[PDB]
């Protein structure tokens, strides 16, 4: 999967419990400019993560 995005550019009919989030995700103002790295440790039983 590569970065394919969406912008406020035919009509759709979603279930309206998903449509709220779907339309929220179309606004570029809701995304940070740079990735926010993880900070809470997990998967302690593996070194492949490093």
């Amino acid at each position: 999967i590569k970065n394919i995005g969406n912008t406020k550019s035919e009509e759709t009919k979603f279930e309206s419990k998903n449509n709220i989030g779907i339309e929220y995700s179309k606004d570029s103002r809701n995304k940070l400019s740079y990735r926010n790295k993880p900070s809470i440790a997990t998967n302690l039983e593996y070194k492949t993560l490093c």
Partner: protein, 1130 residues
């Protein structure tokens, strides 16, 4: 078949309840309630107009002594004489100043006016049943008259429809934009509050901005957060509201609830030492300063916060807060499940205006304008002069007269269709139009219209397509008086507060109970079902004094109990199902006692068998579609239903009840059949020889005998709309194709489907012209008194009355291509002379006239055949009409064959075992098997001729015969469908449409042929016809068609320099503009249309100069050419 009998019982009259004619009853009452009761309440007022000092010096206006009286002549006299039919209303007005004194009340008169003897108010009066009005309590009824019309100033009959109100009973939801929604509603005062107050509110919610969840209005209320407003009104914590809004909600709505509550809490904490009262007061004061209100802050605040919800005036604030909370709950639910919330086009959220409501609203508005004008005049007089003098000529024109006249003229607020001139096409129209309901501009067939409106009766073309509906025969619209309203509301409230004392104060997890949208309590959820059941039982026993109260239980997740009592609601009867038990089936005495009881008797003596249900209650109930289907279910299944429905024939309107077996045909044919049923010629009027009006009348009528019950109770059958004729379904020499028909000459000669057309003519003449003493060729039908002679036939150039302008005849002329006989003449002499003439002409069928059956098989006369040219059967019978058989089966009109079969069966045996005339029941929406009808026909024929072979009996049952060719007297190959049927003649006549023009008048501006069939106009050659001519390649033809006539040519010169048309002075062509500039340009002749010159001159007037050049190609010479062959080498 008990359900059918109970249904029939509603259609017949009920004298004990005052119902003399069911189809129009609800309209009569609607008007009677206005003229007798509501007008008095509206007019009888005693109000302050201005105040001075401090509530101790005020002017007061009072109106009293309201009296209404009817005319002294009958409506037929009004029609003949040309008068109007209006009741007269008079009242007394007093204007007086009052000064509050410690000693009591001080009164000082200023002015007083009376209308004891004056046309102070003229109110159009409703003719009603039997030409009887509500004011006159006479004891004579004109038979075969149902009324429902008005007569206006010019003696023209008017008739109206019903209209859907603009204000809805449910809030409207709208998606303003992605994740941004609104919820708007209205509040109105109860009926007994004069004048009426209105408020419109809007709630806005945006996911991006949850702190601005705001309720607002226009210049009447503050813009505030709805949660905080609810806290202010109800004095409850935010956690209480959180728990309330999420008690029984799906988990996806609870997240939005939490977000909203947290945003409200954040707003609360953003201010130092928050106080709800201070917050509201600061908002109010900011609004006060923002506006330029001159009132004190206390007055402004009291006005704002006391008139918050007009429909809930005089109730504590906590109930208003809980009402706001319930509205918010519904808003959120509709946000997440939109399709499960009532749509804006649903009939669940609308009410309907009847005849009397138009008058009520106009009276309200005019009275308010009257008082406003009086106040303004008094204020101006005080400002300029002194002593507070009230000018005259402002308290003598209440303005109701012009309001009512405009109402009858066809204007009502933003609508222009409430009333119209009655088209006298058919008798049944007097039922059809007053039972129509019109909607504001929705064209789709919404499910909520089913079972209360006719499925098939709607406009088929034009701008009204899908905007006008027709009530079903069992539907009605409610009426109620103010005192009845108050008593009913009081009884309901007392019942609630008495029988449920301990369980009506939940307010957090309960079901709110509203009466006309006004919250009065909140019920414990565990007891909802009982409350409803016990309520309905008490409703059916007459406990509340009214059997039409509506109660709705909304449970999806909105959790409400709604009670409706107001006027304008659609109601029908239903069969009751109680605890999985159909009550009709557990009442043995009813079957034996039914024949001797009326509908109200059944309601009184056997309650719980039938219940009156309105549309909102119907939409939220579980209803079994038929009794037969109910009986086939198990008891557990039966326990899920609240009601059972009547047979399908009661779901059609009165117009559709004229058709037979519409559910055996394609639906489009049903729409067409409803359309053409209203155009069939009937016994239009008992006053055929008295009324001076347009009309068409059937000459030798017959009563149909294959009918439904509704057609009989409404009296449509008794007034007739056709004749029984003998038809054959076959091809006649290839002549009757594409819906053409053959008709028999001798049938026409003897009076078959003969009609009479009647027309009204009216002229006004100056007295000098009428009395002028000169014989022009157009006065050959006049008597010595200057009026047309009785029983004379007028032609297309004759005048009806002498009208000479002084030595020139300037009279109007008769302009029909057929003659007519003078039946009646009426003359009024005044400053002018008014002449009215009624003429008649009989019109036997001719080529091109239009006919149809009751299954929508329409056609025109294609050939008139002599009796000796038609095929005949063994008894010597020849058909009156021949219709091509193919169209019966390609259009799938099966019920026509069944109708013919049953008509023949009736003819064989038309009487009962008692010898009484016995009609055959074949309803629209039939439900009876074809085999049963065949068995009935077989029994009829076996009674007729006991000795018939099997083949002969089969032929008689199926209406098949051998026919013989009259030219050779030999049989045709196969048998032909042949028999009697009720046939209709339609109002489209050939000689009413034919037109021709040779030469005539022209329009002045463009000099082209004028328009109008009655004015000798010409047909328009449009641009699509021009396209076709160009497609043919006929250039000269189109050029000649579009040019001016060759006989209208003249010499016209144009200046080649500036383009002006050259003038001709003393016989010399000259360009004035160029001559003034000392130039000598060329002048050239042009051959163009007059309209081109007008267009160019107007373009010049707009400042555009148009210059034309001309071609001067050098001369050319012909040269011999060498020969060419072009053939191939073979």
């Amino acid at each position: 078949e008990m359900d059918q009998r109970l249904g029939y019982k509603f259609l017949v009259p009920d004298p004990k309840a005052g119902v003399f004619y069911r189809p129009l009853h609800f309209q009569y009452v609607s008007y009677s309630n206005f003229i007798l009761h509501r007008l008095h309440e509206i007019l009888t007022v005693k109000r302050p107009l201005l105040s001075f000092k401090n509530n101790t010096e005020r002017i007061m206006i009072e109106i009293s002594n309201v009296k209404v009286t009817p005319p002294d002549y009958s409506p037929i006299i009004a029609s003949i004489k040309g008068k109007s039919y209006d009741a007269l209303a008079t009242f007394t007005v007093n204007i007086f100043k009052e000064v509050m004194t410690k000693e009591g009340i001080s009164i000082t008169k200023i002015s007083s006016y009376e209308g004891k003897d004056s046309h102070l108010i003229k109110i159009p009066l409703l003719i009603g049943y039997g030409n009887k009005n509500p004011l006159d309590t006479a004891k004579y009824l004109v038979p075969n008259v149902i009324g429902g019309v008005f007569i206006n100033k010019q003696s023209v009959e008017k008739v109206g429809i019903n209209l859907v109100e603009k204000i809805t009973t449910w809030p409207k939801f709208r998606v303003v934009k992605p994740n941004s929604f609104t919820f708007s509603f209205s509040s109105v005062s109860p009926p007994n509050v004069l004048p009426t107050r209105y408020r419109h509110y809007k709630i806005s919610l945006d996911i991006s901005q949850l702190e601005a969840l705001n309720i607002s209005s226009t210049k009447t209320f503050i813009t505030v957060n709805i949660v905080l407003l609810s806290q202010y009104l109800s004095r409850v914590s935010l956690e209480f509201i959180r728990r309330s809004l999420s008690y029984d909600m799906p988990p996806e709505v609870v997240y939005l609830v939490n977000a909203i509550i947290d945003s409200a809490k954040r707003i609360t904490e953003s201010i130092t030492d928050f106080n709800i009262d201070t917050y509201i007061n600061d908002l109010v004061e900011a609004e006060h300063i923002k506006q330029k209100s001159q009132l004190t802050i206390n007055e402004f605040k009291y006005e704002m916060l006391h008139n918050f919800l007009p429909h809930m005036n005089y109730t504590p604030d906590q109930l208003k807060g809980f009402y706001m909370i319930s509205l918010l709950r519904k808003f959120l639910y509709c946000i997440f499940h939109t399709s499960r919330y009532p749509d804006r086009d649903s009939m669940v959220c609308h009410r309907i205006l009847t005849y009397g409501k138009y008058f009520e609203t106009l009276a309200h508005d005019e009275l308010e304008n009257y008082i406003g004008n009086i106040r303004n005049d008094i204020m101006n007089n005080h400002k300029n002069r002194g002593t507070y003098a009230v000018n005259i000529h402002v308290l003598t024109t209440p303005g109701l007269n012009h309001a009512f006249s405009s109402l009858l003229s066809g204007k009502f607020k933003k609508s222009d269709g409430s009333y119209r001139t009655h088209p006298h096409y058919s008798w049944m129209q007097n039922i059809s139009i007053p039972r129509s309901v019109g909607f504001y501009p929705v064209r789709k067939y919404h499910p909520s219209q089913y079972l209360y409106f006719c499925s098939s009766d709607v406009p088929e073309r034009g701008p009204q397509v899908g905007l006008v509906s027709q009530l079903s025969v069992l539907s009605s619209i409610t009426n109620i008086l103010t005192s009845e309203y108050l008593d009913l509301e009081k009884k309901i409230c007392e019942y609630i507060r008495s029988y449920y004392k301990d369980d009506i104060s939940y307010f957090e997890t309960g079901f709110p109970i509203t009466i006309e949208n006004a919250l009065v309590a909140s019920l414990n959820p565990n007891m909802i079902c009982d409350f409803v059941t016990d309520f309905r039982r008490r409703k059916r026993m007459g406990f509340f004094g009214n059997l039409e109260v509506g109660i709705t239980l909304v449970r999806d997740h909105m959790n409400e109990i709604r009670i409706n009592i107001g006027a304008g609601r659609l109601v029908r009867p239903f069969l009751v199902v109680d605890n999985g038990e159909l009550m009709m089936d557990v009442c043995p005495e009813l079957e034996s006692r039914l024949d001797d009881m009326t509908f109200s008797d059944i309601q009184k003596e056997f309650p719980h068998v039938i219940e009156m249900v309105d549309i909102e209650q119907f939409t939220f109930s579980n209803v079994c579609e038929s009794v037969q289907k109910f009986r086939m279910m198990s008891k557990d299944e039966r326990k899920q239903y609240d009601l059972c429905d009547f047979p399908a024939e009661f779901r059609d309107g009165y117009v559709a009840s004229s058709l037979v077996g519409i559910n055996h045909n394609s639906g489009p044919r049903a729409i067409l059949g409803c359309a053409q049923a209203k155009q069939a010629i009937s016994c239009l009027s008992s006053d055929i020889r008295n009324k001076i009006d347009n009309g068409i009348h059937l000459m030798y009528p017959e009563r149909p005998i294959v009918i439904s019950k509704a057609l009989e109770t409404s009296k449509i059958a008794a007034n007739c709309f056709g004749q029984h004729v003998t038809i054959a379904l076959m091809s006649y020499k290839g002549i009757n194709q594409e819906d053409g028909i053959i008709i028999k000459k001798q049938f026409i000669q003897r009076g078959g489907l003969d009609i009479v057309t009647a027309k009204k003519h009216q002229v006004e003449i100056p007295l000098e012209n009428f009395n002028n003493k000169e014989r022009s060729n157009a006065y050959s039908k006049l008597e010595s008194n200057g009026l047309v002679r009785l029983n004379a036939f007028l032609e297309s150039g004759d005048a009806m009355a002498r009208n000479i302008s002084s030595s020139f005849d300037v009279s109007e002329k008769y302009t029909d291509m057929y003659k007519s006989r003078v039946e009646r003449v009426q003359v009024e002499l005044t400053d002018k002379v008014k002449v009215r003439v009624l003429t008649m002409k009989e019109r036997r069928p001719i080529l091109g006239d239009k006919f149809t059956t009751r299954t929508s098989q329409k056609g025109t006369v294609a050939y008139v055949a002599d009796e000796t040219e038609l095929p005949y059967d063994e008894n010597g019978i020849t058909p009156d009409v021949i219709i091509n058989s193919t169209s019966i089966f390609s259009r799938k009109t099966i019920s026509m064959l069944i109708e013919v079969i049953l008509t023949a069966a009736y003819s064989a045996k038309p009487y009962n075992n008692k010898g009484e005339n016995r009609p055959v029941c074949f309803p629209s929406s039939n439900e009876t098997s074809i085999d049963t009808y065949m068995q009935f026909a077989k029994q009829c024929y076996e009674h007729s001729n006991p000795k018939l072979s099997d083949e002969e009996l089969s032929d008689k049952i199926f209406c098949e015969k051998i026919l013989y060719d009259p030219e050779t007297d030999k049989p045709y190959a196969s048998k032909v469908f042949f028999g009697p049927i009720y046939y209709l003649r339609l109002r489209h006549l050939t000689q009413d449409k034919a037109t021709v023009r040779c030469r005539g008048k022209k329009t002045k501006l463009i000099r082209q042929a004028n328009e109008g069939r009655k004015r000798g106009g010409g047909i328009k050659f449009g641009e699509m016809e021009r396209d076709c001519l160009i497609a043919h390649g006929a250039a000269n033809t189109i050029t000649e068609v579009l040019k001016d006539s060759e006989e209208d040519y003249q010499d016209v010169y144009v200046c080649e320099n500036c383009g002006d048309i050259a003038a001709q002075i003393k016989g010399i062509n000259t360009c004035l503009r160029c001559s003034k500039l000392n130039l000598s340009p060329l002048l050239t002749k042009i051959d163009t249309t007059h309209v081109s010159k007008v267009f160019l001159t107007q373009m010049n007037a707009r400042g555009v100069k148009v210059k034309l050049d001309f071609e001067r190609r050098p001369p050319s010479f012909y040269k011999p050419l060498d020969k060419v062959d072009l053939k191939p080498s073979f």
